[PDB]
Amino acid sequence: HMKITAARVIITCPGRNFVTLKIETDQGVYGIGDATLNGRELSVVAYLQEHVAPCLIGMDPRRIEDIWQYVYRGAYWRRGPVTMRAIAAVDMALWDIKAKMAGMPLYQLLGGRSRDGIMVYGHANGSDIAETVEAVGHYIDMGYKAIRAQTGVPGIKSLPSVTGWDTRKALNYVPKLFEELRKTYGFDHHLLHDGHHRYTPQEAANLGKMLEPYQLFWLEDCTPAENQEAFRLVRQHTVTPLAVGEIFNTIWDAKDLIQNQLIDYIRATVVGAGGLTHLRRIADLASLYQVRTGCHGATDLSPVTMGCALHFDTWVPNFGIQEYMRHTEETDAVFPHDYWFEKGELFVGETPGHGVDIDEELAAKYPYKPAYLPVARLEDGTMWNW
Amino acid sequence: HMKITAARVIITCPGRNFVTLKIETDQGVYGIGDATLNGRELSVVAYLQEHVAPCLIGMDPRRIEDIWQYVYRGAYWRRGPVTMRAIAAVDMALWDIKAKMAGMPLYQLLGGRSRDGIMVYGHANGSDIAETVEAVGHYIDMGYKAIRAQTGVPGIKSLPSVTGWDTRKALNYVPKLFEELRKTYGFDHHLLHDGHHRYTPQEAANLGKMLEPYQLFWLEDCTPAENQEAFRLVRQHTVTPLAVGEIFNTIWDAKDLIQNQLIDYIRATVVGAGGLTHLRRIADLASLYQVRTGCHGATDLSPVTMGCALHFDTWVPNFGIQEYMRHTEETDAVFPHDYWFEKGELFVGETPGHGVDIDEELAAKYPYKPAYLPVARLEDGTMWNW
Amino acid sequence: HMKITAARVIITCPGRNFVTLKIETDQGVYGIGDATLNGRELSVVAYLQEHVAPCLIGMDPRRIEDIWQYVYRGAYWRRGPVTMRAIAAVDMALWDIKAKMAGMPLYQLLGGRSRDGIMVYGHANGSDIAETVEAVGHYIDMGYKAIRAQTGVPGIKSLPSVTGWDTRKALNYVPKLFEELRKTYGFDHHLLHDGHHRYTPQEAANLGKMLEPYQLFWLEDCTPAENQEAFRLVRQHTVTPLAVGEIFNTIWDAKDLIQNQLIDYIRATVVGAGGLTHLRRIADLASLYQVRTGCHGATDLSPVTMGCALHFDTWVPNFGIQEYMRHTEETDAVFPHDYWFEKGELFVGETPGHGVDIDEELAAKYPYKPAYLPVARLEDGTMWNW
Amino acid sequence: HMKITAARVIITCPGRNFVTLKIETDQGVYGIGDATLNGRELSVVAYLQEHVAPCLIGMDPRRIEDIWQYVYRGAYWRRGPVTMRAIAAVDMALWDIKAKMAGMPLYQLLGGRSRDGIMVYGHANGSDIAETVEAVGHYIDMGYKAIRAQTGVPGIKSLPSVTGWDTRKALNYVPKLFEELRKTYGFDHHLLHDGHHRYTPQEAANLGKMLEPYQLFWLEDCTPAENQEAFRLVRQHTVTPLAVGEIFNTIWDAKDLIQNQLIDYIRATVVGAGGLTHLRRIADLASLYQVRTGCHGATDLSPVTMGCALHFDTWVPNFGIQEYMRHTEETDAVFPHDYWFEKGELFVGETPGHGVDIDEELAAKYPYKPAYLPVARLEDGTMWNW
Ligand SMILES: [Mg+2]
Ligand SMILES: [Mg+2]
Ligand SMILES: [Mg+2]
Ligand SMILES: [Mg+2]
């Protein structure tokens, strides 16, 4: 059989850090996968380079499922952010190889096209309501159909930045943002809000109810969800739609949230949750309960992830929306890709594979630089959820 | 305030790989913690050295809870084998410092002594029933009160070794081991069996029922438990006691298994599940339902973990048993410790701290060497659970 | 081992009755604990002096957990207000000794500091809405961040005083208090209300809904809770936050209220619910469901309890709020302590122990005087819940 | 109205300690009630003498329900062993007065006679199986229809005595006792066993199954029951009948055990659980699920309790059995009573009241002497349940 000859980790920082796995074969064809774990990147580098990659040498890269099961089960210690990023990188690279060998863009292998373009949302941010309202208008004018709106709250504020938070101040202020947005722009546009893990379940229920008159597309990550019962009170009390899951890494993180009908959108991603192989299983479970996909799409997911995400989004029947933050020009140059943006939609191209590659010579000119996600504390100093 | 000046990772292989974190302070006192993750060790090295440790510099090491919450919440991507090993290492080192500063052995700070010695079990292994029966006898003769018995099954068989498995062959053979053990040795000794994740829930129910006449201390890890509902059928159908959790890393992995009364012993460890700080919370939840601790204790948990485990075991009210595999002489020399074994019990000493230290000069003479856990496949080649 | 030489009960009335246990040792170090049970004080005196204390003589006071289990299990008749006050007094005294021996303030032994100051609420009372609104303003002006507001209701009224109650009159009046408070002071301040056990579950649901526009911090003790299902209808029908538990004495009183997510704040105290040892277990169970601590803090909890409560509050991750009623000057003199109040927050000091002591010579100058809590009856004479 | 003039506490030790309340009135009629709480007796003395009794002076003793509610609700701190003993003593004394005033034995006021004699069980104890089998035979020969059988286990062992325990040793031995009893005496006699709180739920399930061939009348107190879910696994796994509740003090301790059909007999008593008034409510809830009464009846319940218990047992429709341990001759002389034993049954007499009185002059000749219940520890020293 054809064999894996190398599984190499490539690190680059063209505006921010990205980690990529390149699986090479004895036939010539290669595939690439994203391994980026924002703020903990080098843990995945080691997991791959020192442990997983040596096991892959000599394996048959056509055996996507077997290799997935080998790395998942064979680890012994199962699941987790680092573990699943490594598995995702392998899986993306193997699907890239499979699609190249089939002479087809990846969405064709998944079951073909279900839709034309992929609806996105962008990020309208402001320091206060007035600034945020202005920002949403600029996104509307750019042709976005859906916009996430986030405001700073008056009275709230190389190593992690420490930010402040106060729930009462936010509960008193956030609903007024959405009131003003609907007064200014009407109800035609999809409006989204990220609760950023800040609220208890009762508080999220309160906030959800206060947001009902404004017909939100979703309220996201309203309360920490390691306990999958945490969404129960929220769902009982509000008809504001709920989303969660960018930080999830396996179906086991979401099975009860889905089966108990506690969420409307699942936000797990190709890189976060174990590749195309595993994300398909999450989306299928979701579909049984009419839960839709809402893949996370911040810049810390490389263009390799975005290419795979768009192939996935183009096929998956229960697609909801795709988050889109634009990468830097330098990032786009390091990772040439066959997808594009037009009038509020992303489109994947027909290049065999997932359509993304990496320019290794150029990537080597942007050295790794440590960078951390911020943390949050309450006014009294209590460590909180950022 | 006193400050952390360094948080250094030390790697050594005195018979097998161990990773240790040493937290140093500007007062002079230091603490150490185990970070060893068998078969994925260097992923934790990177998680600590490249990401967590730089954040700890300048922090007040007296703030154990705050630092735990900072590393747990501040990671953004929560839980997981690598993540929680890093957190455990920090937590052990900080409790070591706290106990040293208090001038007390660690168990005193946890609430003091609940018992004298710590009951252990050892591993009696054989290639067939006859060999396994002989091995159990040797453990009995050595004064062990509790013995795990594992047999090879006739017809079943630097990089991971690939082993074979067949469930029907095992279901036909394993119960006969326990029949023979009770015929030979009677019912005085505690007898344990590790199902090694091999069975479905229905199969584990079947096996559990077949083992009932032999009054086992536990049947462990009978079926994979990422789905916490997996133990439901087993518990419904058998009164053989059930244990699980060496591979768990947070309370979120076990909350339903405990609250639904699906297990008798929780096997999570100080190193696996986030240190003394977090393991206490797991044990307390367990206690509400009369579930007892049965900490895993294989050699891939360093003597630093064993010292912390024994301090924990000496205090915790709902102690059940402690697994004990003896380390090599070289490992014992690299990690001098104040605990000892006598007549089937471990005992922790009175040295302030957790009682363990690391000889860095000696540790440097045993270089890291890659080593992997085995994997298992069914007879047709299907990737399985080892 | 070091031994308990005496466990002495001290009674004093420096403005109101307090009972204190002092555990003395053969090394010299001693510890003190609160045993005060308002309106039934001498039952605890007897429980301790005639029964528990003689068993403690000769025990090793370092064995906090063992002694807790001995007094809890060994009583045979388990739980209860008198029983648990006795256990709490012992536990506080033993933690006081442990912290003194460690040379650390108590919060350090619990896991260290999670926050700086401790947010409190005070009691704004009035005979009608106008008077109550004035009182809340005075608390705001004094720098309180949180205020409990209680009003008399027009038409409602050495041995226990008999008070009157009528639910319909209150349901028609209480919501107007919170309407007026928000009209007058806005939404910046945390506003609390104690329902004083007066309502049925349906009535509490009704009241909770009527209070929703006013964004309360909590509605407390809305309905009697011996039946832990009593909060179910309330939680189903309102997003007003719920608190309960000042009269609870073990985790068994609260486990279902917590696990079924029926409350936002648990109000159990160090003295009410079995000391630091047991209150930690309650707080930890609460944390799994994002339930926060809201310890009761009326004057019938002595400064010994307040010191322990503040050490607990300084460490506990899921802190919510601390009730604060100021003791008399005479009480403060009898129980010198290292905690203080500034701008709406309490702060614990660094004195080893819980930081509180008792001046026995001064305490002896204020003799015990019987005093009872009031009772309540409905308009027709029916015995009710005060 | 007629008034309570005194409510006096009388203490005596005619072989063991008893506490009695005597309520006197301005008409002349008086009533007495048991307040005995074994091993904590003087806590109830204080609760009554220093707190409750002064509130009763001047009340109308005909108002049994109102006084019950006053002492129960008015305490503020609700339920508990000490609290409920005090309430029980009052309630018994008031029912005694009511029956005297009606000119009827107490059972007539409860609803009249449902049966003739009251089936009892006695205690056959032995140090080993042979001795226990002999003891059961002596009870059979004395005409007992029902016998509790308790054996010591080989290998198991003024201040509380410390006893030993080991679960595995007992699980290996106890079933053989019942095997031998059925071999020797056949199946005609009711055979009972008290598990003495020693087992976990899984262990109790195991034991229950092992006892099935021997057709026990009940297995009692198999596992601690503060968590009312503790009986769930036991009930799921065995058809051996289950009993619990001698240590319960309110219906709130038993409501879920009853409604979830986890027990066959409720063992709460007139003295333990708040008098005739409250025990009636427990028995009625039990009856809905065909659960029967099995009142505890050890010697630490005075003849005042036994008289009330027998009046209750004579009326209650869902009577199951009454425990009977004979008091000393001296105890019988101090508490003259109208009940008697014949051929395995107790009978209550027709004396108006509950039929019991106290000879105060004689009682004064037997002074109080401290005496404690034993405690139990596991072999390693762990504090356990006696
Ligand atoms: Mg987000
Ligand atoms: Mg194992
Ligand atoms: Mg209150
Ligand atoms: Mg009993």
Give your account of this protein's structure.
- By secondary structure, chain A is an alpha/beta fold.
- Chain A folds into 2 domains: 1-105 and 351-386, Enolase-like, domain 1; 106-350, TIM Barrel (Alpha-Beta Barrel).
- Helices cover 37% and strands 19% of the residues of chain A.
- Chain A has helices at 41-56, 64-74, 81-102, 106-110, 129-141, 167-171, 174-185, 201-211, 232-237, 255-259, 275-288, 303-315, 329-334, 360-363, and strands at 4-12, 18-25, 30-34, 118-126, 146-151, 162-165, 190-194, 218-220, 242-244, 265-266, 292-293, 322-323, 339-342, 345-348, 375-378, 383-384.
- In chain A, strands 4, 5, 7, 8, 9, 10, 11, 12, 13 and 14 form a 10-stranded mixed sheet that branches.
- In chain A, helix 1 crosses helix 3, helix 2 (64-74) packs antiparallel against helix 3 (81-102) and helix 5 crosses helix 7 (174-185).
- Chain A is globular and about 65 Å long.
- The termini of chain A are far apart.
- In chain A, 54% of the residues are buried.
- The B-D interface holds B 114-119, 187-188, 190, 215, 235-236, 239, 241, 261, 264, 288-290, 292, 317, 319, 345 and D 168, 171-172, 200-202, 205-206, 209, 223-224, 227, 229-230, 232-233, 236-237, 378, 380-383.
- Residues 194, 220-221, 246 of chain B line the site of one magnesium ion.
- The PDB classes it as metal binding protein.
- The entry lists the keywords TIM barrel, metal binding protein.
- Crystal structure of D-Mannonate dehydratase from Novosphingobium aromaticivorans mutant (V161A, R163A, K165G, L166A, Y167G, Y168A, E169G).
